[PDB]
C-alpha cells in the first residue's frame, strides 16, 4: 500500500513537473506568426 | 413460514394496546398516560396479565386509578422479538 502511495506520488510529481516546466519553456513564442 | 407481525394482528394486539409489544406512542390515544406513565409501563414490561400494570413501583394513588380507568383498553400477548428488538418500542420508524 505505502509502496503504491509512494509510487503514485512520484508519478504525479513527475508529470506535474513536466507541465509547469513545459509551459515555462517559452510557450508564447510557440505560434505560427 | 409465517409473518410474525401479520399473525400478531390476529390476536388482541390488533385491537388494544399490548403492554408488552406496542410502541409507546399508542399511549397518546388515552388520557393521562403519556409520557410519564407510558415510560414506566414500557420500562417495566413484560406482564403476565394486564392487572400486573398497577404493581409498578413508585406509583401515586392518582396514577394507579388512571391505569384502572384504562385497563379496559389494555391487553397482553406473548413477547414478540420482531416488535421489541431494535429499540422499536421507543421508535418503530413511523413518524407522520
Amino acid at each position: 500500500m505505502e509502496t503504491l502511495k509512494i509510487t503514485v506520488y512520484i508519478v504525479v510529481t513527475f508529470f506535474v513537473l513536466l507541465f509547469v516546466f513545459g509551459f515555462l519553456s517559452g510557450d508564447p513564442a510557440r505560434n505560427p506568426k | 413460514l409465517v409473518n410474525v407481525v401479520d399473525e400478531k394482528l390476529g390476536t388482541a394486539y390488533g385491537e388494544k394496546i399490548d403492554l408488552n409489544n406496542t410502541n409507546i406512542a399508542a399511549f397518546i390515544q388515552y388520557r393521562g398516560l403519556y409520557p410519564t406513565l407510558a415510560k414506566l409501563i414500557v420500562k417495566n414490561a413484560p406482564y403476565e396479565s394486564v392487572e400486573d400494570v398497577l404493581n409498578i413501583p413508585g406509583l401515586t394513588e392518582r396514577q394507579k386509578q388512571i391505569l384502572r380507568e384504562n385497563l379496559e383498553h389494555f391487553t397482553v400477548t406473548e413477547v414478540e422479538t420482531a416488535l421489541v428488538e431494535g429499540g422499536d418500542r421507543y421508535n418503530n420508524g413511523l413518524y407522520k
Partner: protein, 447 residues
C-alpha cells in the same frame, strides 16, 4: 463609433484599453457602485430588521457580516443596539457619492489619456516596470486592509466568537497564532472530507494570526514589486497586455469565488451560525441530536439501540472508529459546533455525557437548527421540495453559496475568454486567418 477602434457597441468597453483617463474613470465609477450597494443594502436590511427574530429568518446577508466583526451584538449573538449597522450603511453610501463623482469626472470630463498629463499616473500596458509598480502599491493597500481586521480584533473591540466559553460573545483577541506550522499548515491540509483546506479554520486566534501574516506578506511583496522589474523567466512565460492582466485576475477572482462558496457552506466560525443559520451538516446533526434527546427522555438506551439496517439507530462508528451520530447523518460526522462539542469525548460522542449532561439550551439549539436547515425553494418556501407553503425561509448560506458559485463559474468562463483572446491578439490572429499566409496550408499533412 466602431469604425475608429474596431470594437462594436456590445464590446464598447474594449475601446477603453488604451485610454487611461477614461479607463480610470470607469473603474472609479464601478467601485462607487459596489460601495453604493453595500451601504444601500445595509440600510434596507436595517429598515427591515426585527431584533426579536434571528437574522437568518429575515433574509439578511450584510448585517451578519457587520455583527461578526463585533459591532452591534452581545452574548450569544443577540442584537443589543442597531446604530453601528446604521453607520456602516450611511458611510458606505456617502462614500459611494465621492467615488461616483470622481469616476464620472474622469470618464466624460477629465483627460482621456493620462500619459501626456502626468508621467506617474500614466501607464503603458507593455511596460513591465510601471505595471509591477502599480501592482506593488495595491499589494500595500491590501496588506493594510488585512491589518485593519487585526486591529479591530486586537485593539478595537474584538470579534464575535461563537466558541467563547459560556456561549459565544464579542471577545478581544490577545494571542493571535503566529506559529507558521499552524498558519501555513491550513494552506497544506487536504481539501477533502474531515480535512477542509483553509475552510477548516475554527478559532479566531488562527484567523487573526493568518491575517497578520498575509498583511505582512503583502506589504513586503508590494515593496518588492515597486523596487524590481520582472525577471527574464517571467518575461518569456507571460503575455504582457491589458487584456492578459485582466484574464489573470479573472482566473484569480474565479478561484476566490469558489473558495468563498465552500467557506460559507461549511465554516461556522467566520460565519457564525448565530447570524447565518446552521450549516448543512450542522442542521442534519442537530436533527439526530433532537431525536436522541426525545427518545432517551422516553427511556431508550441510545447506545445499544439497533437500527433497521443493523447499524445503530442513534449512534454508530466512523470509518476510523469515532462514535458518531447514526442514520443518514453518518456523512456529516466531521461537523463541529459549540452546541455539540461538550458531548464530545476523546473517542467521539461520549455515551455517559449523552445520558446525564445535556443541557436545556442544547436541546433548544438542536431543535432550532433542525428546523432551519439550509433547504428551500427559489421562491423561499422552507423545507424539502415536497413541503407545503407556510414557512418563508431560505438560509443566507444557500443564498450566499449559490450566488458566488454562479459568479465564480462565469468568471472562470471570463478567464478562458480573455486569456485565449489575449494570446491571440499578441500573436496577431485574433481577427481571423490571413488567407495569403494560412498556417495549416504550410504544415505537412497528418497522413
Amino acid at each position: 463609433d466602431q469604425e475608429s477602434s474596431g470594437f462594436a457597441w456590445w464590446a464598447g468597453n474594449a475601446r477603453l484599453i488604451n485610454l487611461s483617463g477614461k479607463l480610470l474613470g470607469a473603474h472609479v465609477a464601478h467601485a462607487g457602485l459596489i460601495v453604493f450597494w453595500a451601504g444601500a443594502m445595509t440600510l434596507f436590511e436595517l429598515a427591515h430588521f426585527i431584533p426579536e427574530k434571528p437574522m437568518y429568518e429575515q433574509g439578511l446577508i450584510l448585517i451578519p457580516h457587520i455583527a461578526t466583526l463585533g459591532w452591534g451584538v452581545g452574548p450569544g449573538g443577540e442584537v443589543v443596539d442597531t446604530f453601528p449597522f446604521f453607520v456602516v450603511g450611511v458611510v458606505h453610501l456617502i462614500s459611494s457619492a465621492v467615488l461616483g463623482f470622481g469616476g464620472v469626472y474622469h470618464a466624460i470630463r477629465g483627460p482621456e489619456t493620462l500619459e501626456e498629463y502626468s508621467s506617474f499616473f500614466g501607464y503603458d500596458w507593455k511596460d513591465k516596470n510601471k505595471m509591477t509598480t502599480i501592482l506593488g502599491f495595491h499589494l500595500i493597500v491590501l496588506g493594510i486592509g488585512a491589518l485593519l481586521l487585526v486591529a479591530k480584533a486586537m485593539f478595537f473591540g474584538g470579534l464575535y466568537d461563537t466558541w467563547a466559553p459560556g456561549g459565544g460573545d464579542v471577545r478581544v483577541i490577545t494571542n493571535p497564532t503566529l506559529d507558521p506550522r499552524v498558519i501555513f499548515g491550513y494552506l497544506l491540509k487536504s481539501p477533502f472530507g474531515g480535512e477542509g483546506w483553509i475552510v477548516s479554520v475554527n478559532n479566531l486566534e488562527d484567523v487573526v494570526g493568518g491575517h497578520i501574516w498575509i498583511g505582512l506578506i503583502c506589504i513586503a511583496g508590494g515593496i518588492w514589486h515597486i523596487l524590481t522589474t520582472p525577471f527574464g523567466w517571467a518575461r518569456r512565460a507571460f503575455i504582457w497586455s491589458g487584456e492578459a492582466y485582466l484574464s489573470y485576475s479573472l482566473g484569480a477572482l474565479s478561484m476566490m469565488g469558489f473558495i468563498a462558496t465552500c467557506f460559507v457552506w461549511f465554516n461556522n466560525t467566520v460565519y457564525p451560525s448565530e447570524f447565518y443559520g446552521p450549516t448543512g451538516p450542522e442542521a442534519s446533526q442537530a436533527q439526530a441530536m433532537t431525536f436522541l434527546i426525545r427518545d432517551q427522555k422516553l427511556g431508550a438506551n441510545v447506545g445499544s439501540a439497533q437500527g433497521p439496517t443493523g447499524l445503530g439507530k442513534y449512534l454508530m462508528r466512523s470509518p476510523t472508529g469515532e462514535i458518531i451520530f447514526g442514520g443518514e447523518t453518518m456523512r456529516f460526522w466531521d461537523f463541529r459546533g459549540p452546541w455539540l462539542e461538550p458531548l464530545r469525548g476523546p473517542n467521539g460522542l461520549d455515551l455517559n455525557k449523552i445520558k446525564n449532561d445535556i443541557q436545556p439550551w442544547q436541546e433548544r439549539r438542536a431543535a432550532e437548527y433542525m428546523t432551519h436547515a439550509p433547504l428551500g425553494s427559489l421562491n423561499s418556501v422552507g423545507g424539502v421540495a415536497t413541503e407545503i407553503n407556510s414557512v418563508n425561509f431560505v438560509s443566507p448560506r444557500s443564498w450566499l453559496a449559490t450566488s458566488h458559485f454562479v459568479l465564480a463559474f462565469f468568471f472562470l468562463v471570463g478567464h478562458l475568454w480573455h486569456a485565449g483572446r489575449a494570446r491571440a491578439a499578441a500573436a496577431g490572429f485574433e481577427k481571423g486567418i490571413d488567407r495569403e499566409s494560412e498556417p495549416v496550408l504550410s504544415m505537412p499533412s497528418l497522413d
